[PDB]
Symmetry: D2
Subunit: 486 residues, 4 copies
């Protein structure tokens, strides 16, 4: 009843530097979650990403009632600023203790939020939660922002001062009265998909308590061989904690500590593989930090994301091709098993997001905004930076890699990410007897080894809708339309 | 170089009562395997059942060379009797120590084999390996054979004398010379399927050494709850050792001992569930013993198997329906996941052989000899009795159960064998988001819960080729053709 | 109420070939245990060996009530023959189904028992339980008994016929009425040691159910390295099941089966160490079988045991020396830790029975009947053959080994049985800092390394009562009294 | 070659805030260990405490060479200040980066060290390593130090600001040249006890790498039931890490973090026992922090330790009584097993230091400086504060507990610390058969239960040198000499 913390994307109580700075403030703290998806514009957050919030908020209530604090109130309005001002009015609070995000749509909203509340009479203070450093204090030589990643992260490990350690969770807090503020339940998922969304719990359980159980099971397990099992998609040794790390159920400053703390343990035991796989796991953590630093600084993705160097190219406006690739009647088996895992789990491996999405533009030749709006709706780790950073990288625009005029060609795009075919036979079991040479290209197989395996192309497994040698040249008939104008 | 043992379907060295009776015979023993599939008539043994033999023979050689004995010679001819007489001629042997099988095609061959060898001058002696008792010494009240199972097996546990215990494996044997007999390698699998058959090793490894590893992993594991997990097909708690138990890699007299020996351990520990699941596991072992006793005695399946009370009914002669059911474009999802597991593993659960095969006759209305000849070609536990006993039982003819004029109706044929749908979503992952009420019948679902789950019937998942209410009456238009003639 | 089985030293229900031959006999069986220790003469069985029976009988009652059978009646009289005749009179039984033992005091009693019962009118039948073969059917070349062990056991593995396998335990039996026979409880242990005997349960739990738990924990565990950890006494890798194997709680025919059954498993896995340690474990089992065969056949230990080639030698008649060696104020540390383990556990390692008992005769020069009567009173595996076979062997009389005119000399009698000193420091912790060179001989140590370790000889740890160089010649002053008379 | 760190009692590299503040200082760092035990006066550190340093320094060299840094130089002189000034002269260093200890003998030495080096021209800076807070910033109400513990530690958990978290270990450091400074090996242990000290490695391995292996094995293990297994000495569930925590191989700020971090994990799982045993483990950690705060502040143990309210009382000057209690010929079995564990392991439980030391003064009536000088010589966790705080507490002088005019009386001083007698029978196995009522007092036993257990008092187990009812009044004849003078 003195200060408020309102969570936005930090759904945790361990080392949260707005709740722990509320416990030692002396007065009473009441928490909050204002839900306004109409403010976020075209980035109405997901459809299974909206499922994760409703099960993580209810996990946060029973984890924060045991520290005291009564409840976690949840209000709903069109914009945050009317609802948050009505919250300090209803409760009679003096401060607002939030922490700044780095979306280009919330950064304009946060200074607009700090402009409404401070002119009223209450005082606010922002903090730094889901980032190692802050993106304005990391600089290059003179004063500028970086424009690449490998010059950037070489400054990020060789800082003058180390990142601040995970500060202690609070001992106990107090709300005073749990009934002055009339909280209300609110819908997140639709009523037609009230039962079809509960089938994502076969692989994913949300909550902050399951975030550190998933972290510690990775440190003892697959971190010792992350340097070699990084690309292989058949085994689940790739630390499936990015939905925890996107919604702030796991702090980046704790994963940076515990990996570095046990890098020293393996460093003086002669394990040269397990110490190499710790500098390569923190590099991937730095890719998350670089995407937040990119949308805040100089490029900024100035008005909308999915933007670096295109949006003329003569795409086919065929909706039924978007009905085939979404369903998976595509014939190319590696982009077909990846398109079935995304629907069944709400999850893909990073190298399988490489081949599913690059097939969507370079072979199928569809507009890339149809690929984002489908990835945005059914995925769990669907943020505004990394979905914009990754689509930028795979379809080709950072001077980092994965250029155009280059189709996937799954003959050798599969022998690096899936050597034995344990990923194709897991997800399309109608292809489970092809002897691992034609499991990545059944249309290149002779008729004798196909009729022996029980696959008749056309009835059991569909033909490729677009041939590989066709779109190897049909792209260059369309990509030359860039190179006459730019 | 004195006596010969020739293995037929007892590919093991532990408690084999023809090899152990060859070690204590004093002289030298040479083993053999004569392969004549042209003698077996229409029962040319399998196509993946022929894969299991080629990998179990080579497992038997390296397991019997370490007892001595030099080699395991393998000859090939049209009939066994010319090849076996040429074997005692080439090696100068005096005895033949085999053990009698119980196929109606080998029982006529065995007395024909004993008729050729004894008239030459050499002496033979048969033994009893793959059976608990012998089928002529188990009798009913006066002198007759039984005609049912539950009167039969009540005599089989209440015998005057117990079955003979597993006699010790031999200490060491000797062949003398490993080069007098010019052995030859021989083909089992085709050259077109030399690589597609090696993909059954993802679930099955043959050999007698893996038979007791699979047995002991079941006694400590799923035997404690076999009485409740008997019908459920989603979990693999059903002791997958019938391909070991068909080819004689695991003796029935050892499984009867070790289950009964540890039934006593659980009997005086208060475990009333784990002692009930031992009388129900030996009952299923007795179903194997009853099928061998049935083809030898009174019914005998007199000239051919797949025979009890039919073969008029007006079947559709449509080959493309046999191309749909073999592939699995059938729409009924429970008989579709079962039709994909049979092709991927060469294995089905016993209650899934119930619903796949009864759909083949009572709904699709195809001739049952097309169902045997497909089951015979791709299955591992494809014998001559139990494939004939089971097709007789499920399609309805023993006074045991599973009568006609009764379709499967998977609305409640699935809630006993697959309660949560973990078996359908494992094998058809294009149906992985239906909320477990319409996972067994997608065509009975409303359009809203189907478009939310991403299934559009006709493109993603095919329609039912034959409706359920159609064949519920279209059978009775065809089954009345029995009841005017019989 | 038709036949009786009376247990003597076969306190088990698994593969007991008098109870299982009572179940299939048709009539009702009542079990019994007649306790007459006054018949056994000087071999009144033990004082902790009498503790093991009272806790194994009560374990047998609750293990045989669950098969039916009502009770296990226990009567007490001076001789067995009056009590057993009063038992068939009280119950009206027709047969007596026991199994013959091989003590020279029970073999004369058994034919005296068969002489009383058969002349009355009832019929008896003996069986073979606690032996592999029978000692009259194992012969040498012409017709004679053997006189050694290594010629004997070479016949015992190369028999014409294998030993009979473990026959199945009974399904269920029936006593009919549990109150016609007025059974009575009876004392085994004294009332002064009613509480001091319950402290042997810190290491030993009796019963037949714990016999196979102790057997299977050895087969998976220390049997793979029994060939190298056979002599080392510090680690408990030596299969502590001889108290189970003496009282018939574990059949010898089952241990011969399960070791031989899994010798084949390790034989075709390349484990040359684990297959050697199975031929050396069955050799030690054969030492138990040889001692039973020795007291029945030609030497017979004709009127009393502890007898092969002595009982003149001029022993000291000092009782206080027998008070020192029993207590352990002896100074020699290896025979002192062994004398403390025997009192604390009722158990010694076989190589520690070697050095404790040979020090008792060759150095202390006491009469050997004081050593048996002390070993008989406090030990668990105190039978009439192996206690007589072992004292015969270590003090020297079989042409097998461990001759006289040879003291122990623990300088190198310890570096084979206890290399690091983990056995001395476990049992005399007042010596726990001597640096493993003088842990086996503290009196041979300099004064500086003794005062640094905190041992002052005379107050903390006593001096040797008899010097080593004294009894190295004082024996030969007494052993020359043999060699003038024999 | 720019700054030096010299370790004193912080033998670790993880979160050491003088080495990590040396890595980010830019220049080159060389480490050091100056060994001057002649400066410490009567507190020449231990004889097995001197063994722990020689094996932890050599563990620190191979753990700090892999971070770079060349070596760890070790010089020896009479005082630290001549040797440390000769070290900055030999290497040409500019700074000295140490961290202040809290002994009253080093606190006078540290400001004397800062007085020599700063007047030369080099600059020093101290840090805070082995303490949670600093002892001058924890205050009571007005400005004073505390005089008790329970008022003190209630301020220590309710501080305004939390203790600083474990700061990251260094990435890599550099010495430049490893041969400019002529380092020398040095003796720690005597040559007479070069081999008797290596027998403490049966229970203790030193080093900082084994400190966190011992910590994490306690957090997963016995911390869940520390609240009930705190007093019981028979089981080793009491987190044996005080020799790691005394020599600075494990930071107190890390144990405070990891216990508090997983107190939250058990707090929201319903484990009310495992969350109570975390507030009671940090209390014991606070007892270490209170003893350091006590010798620095107001009482200070002004010129020497072992000092609070005595040193007149008429002690017996008998050296042979000090030869009995050191050896353990004392008859009282609970103080005898504790006196054998201290010699065998160099370790005692905290409640066994309670009864061994209080028997030394209140019953044996010896001067307490003979008890410290014996505890100082053979113990591992022999510091200057807690050895002074504990002797003060048990023999009675803090207003905390354990007053005088109160003997131990092991009849009920044993049924709280050793209920079954598993601690007495472990260490005096000559008493291993007493039936747990007279295992704590054999002289109070009747003769029948003693002769049955094999204990004859006087020869096997010695009599009590001082009777219990004697020193219950003979103390009060000597304690009245206090109460006439004070
Ligand atoms: C002086 C002396 C006295 C002995 N007194 C007894 C006694 O009272 N009771 C008794 O049962 N054994 C006795 N033995 C035999 C030997 O000590 C036992 O084998 C002992 O129990 C070893 O136990 P174990 O389980 O470690 O043997 P293991 O290594 O496990 O051997 C398994 C079995 O082998 C048998 N066995 C092995 N070695 C011998 C042997 N040398 N003689 C006889 N059997 C053997 C035992 O019955 C044992 O159950 C005595 C030996 C000596 C030298």
């Amino acid at each position: 009843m003195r200060i408020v913390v309102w969570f936005r994307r930090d759904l945790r109580v361990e080392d949260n530097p707005a709740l722990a700075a509320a416990a030692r403030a002396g007065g009473e703290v009441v928490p909050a979650y204002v839900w306004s998806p109409e403010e976020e514009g075209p980035y109405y957050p997901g459809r299974v990403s909206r499922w994760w919030i409703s099960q993580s908020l209810n996990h946060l209530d029973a984890s924060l009632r045991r520290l005291g604090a009564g409840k976690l109130v949840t209000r709903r309005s069109a914009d945050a600023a009317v609802a948050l001002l009505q919250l300090v009015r209803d409760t009679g609070a003096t401060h607002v203790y939030f922490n700044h995000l780095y979306d280009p749509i919330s950064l304009v909203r946060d200074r607009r939020l700090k402009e409404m509340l401070a002119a009223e009479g209450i005082v606010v203070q922002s903090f730094n939660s889901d980032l190692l450093y802050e993106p304005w204090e990391v600089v290059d030589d003179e004063g500028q922002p970086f424009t690449m990643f490998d010059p950037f992260w070489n400054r990020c490990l060789s800082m003058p001062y180390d990142p601040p350690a995970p500060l202690l969770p609070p001992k106990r807090i107090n709300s005073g009265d749990l009934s002055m503020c009339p909280s209300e339940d609110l819908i997140f998922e639709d009523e037609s998909e009230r039962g079809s969304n509960a089938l994502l719990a076969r692989a994913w359980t949300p909550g902050w308590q399951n975030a550190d159980k998933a972290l510690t099971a990775f440190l003892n397990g697959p971190l010792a061989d992350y340097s070699v099992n990084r690309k292989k998609a058949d085994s689940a040794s790739t630390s499936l904690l990015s939905p925890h790390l996107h919604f702030g159920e796991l702090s980046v400053r704790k994963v940076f500590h515990l990996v570095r703390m046990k890098q020293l343990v393996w460093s003086n035991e002669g394990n040269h593989a397990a110490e190499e796989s710790c500098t390569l796991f923190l590099r991937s953590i730095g890719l998350r930090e670089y995407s937040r630093y990119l949308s805040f600084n100089h490029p900024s993705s100035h008005e909308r994301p999915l933007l670096a160097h295109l949006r003329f190219f003569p795409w086919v406006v065929d909706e039924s091709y978007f009905k085939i690739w979404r369903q998976g009647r595509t014939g190319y088996p590696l982009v077909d098993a990846g398109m079935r895992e995304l629907w069944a789990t709400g999850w893909l491996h990073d190298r399988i997001r490489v081949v599913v999405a690059s097939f969507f533009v370079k072979v199928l030749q569809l507009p890339a905004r149809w690929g984002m709006k489908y990835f945005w709706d059914t995925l769990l780790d669907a943020d505004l930076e990394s979905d914009a950073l990754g689509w930028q990288y795979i379809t080709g625009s950072l001077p980092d890699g994965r250029e155009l005029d280059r189709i996937d060609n799954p003959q050798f795009e599969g022998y690096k990410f899936d050597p034995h075919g344990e990923y194709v036979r897991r997800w399309i079991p109608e292809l489970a007897r092809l002897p691992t040479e034609w499991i990545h290209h059944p249309w290149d197989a002779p008729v004798s080894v196909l009729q022996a395996a029980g696959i008749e192309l056309g009835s059991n497994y569909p033909l490729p809708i677009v041939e590989l040698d066709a779109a190897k040249g049909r792209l260059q008939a369309a990509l030359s339309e860039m190179w006459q104008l730019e």
